[PDB]
Amino acid sequence: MVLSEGEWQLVLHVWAKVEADVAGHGQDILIRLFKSHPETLEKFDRLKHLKTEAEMKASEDLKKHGVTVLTALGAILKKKGHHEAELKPLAQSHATKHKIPIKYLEFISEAIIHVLHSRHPGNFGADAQGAMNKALELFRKDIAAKYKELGYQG
C-alpha cells in the first residue's frame, strides 16, 4: 500500500501532539496493551512480574521502554513510507530474538489507536484515525514481509 500525502499529514499532525509527552503516551499505550492482552506482558522479561496497573504505573523500566518504542515508531512514521532501513534491525530483533508474532503487533496498533483517540479527540477524528490505521497496517505488512525473509513469519 501507499498513503497519499494528505493521509501522512493527518498522521504527523497527531504525532506532533504525542511528541509533546512521549513518556506519558508510552506508558498509556503499553499499559493498555498489557491490560487488554495480558499474554503480551509475558514476552517482557523485565516487566513480567508486574501484577496490577498501579504497579505498571510506577515501574520506571516500563516507562523507559515506552519511550524507546515510541521514539522508534515515530522515526518510522516521519519517513512517510521510505522506511526500509529503519525496519531491518527492528524486524531482526523482534523475529529472532524476542519472537513477537504479527498478531501482537496488531494488538499494540490497537492500543496506540485507543490512546490517541482518548487523549486527542480533536485531532483524531474518523479521517485521521483511518490515516493512522493505514500507516500502522503499512508498518505491519512491511515487517511481516521481512519476518518471512528472515525465516520467521510469526
Which residue ranges make up the annotated binding site?
65, 94
Separation of alpha carbons 142 and 136, rounded Å = 10
Query: 102: closest CA among 141, 51, 151?
Result: 141
Separation of alpha carbons 15 and 49, rounded Å = 31
Q: Applying CB under 6 A, does 30 fall inside the site for ligand HEM?
A: no
- Smallest gap from Cβ 73 to ligand HEM, in A, equals 4
69 is written with which cell numbers? 518504542
Q: Is 120 exposed, middle or buried (0-12, 13-18, 19+ CB in 10 A)?
A: middle
Residue 13 vs 43, nearer CB to ligand HEM: 43
Separation of alpha carbons 144 and 118, rounded Å = 29
Q: Applying CB under 6 A, does 94 fall inside the site for ligand HEM?
A: yes
Stretch that binds ligand HEM, among 9-17, 101-109, 113-121, 122-130 (CB under 6 A): 101-109
Candidate list 4, 9, 93, 96; residue touching ligand HEM; CB under 6 A? 93
The contact mask relative to ligand HEM for 44-83 (x = CB under 6 A, - = no) is: xxx---------------------xx--xx----------
On the CB side of 73, CA atoms within 13 Å amount to 27
- Smallest gap from Cβ 117 to ligand HEM, in A, equals 16
Which residues of the shown chain bind ligand HEM in the complex (CB under 6 A)? 40, 43-46, 68-69, 72-73, 90, 93-94, 98, 100, 104-105, 108
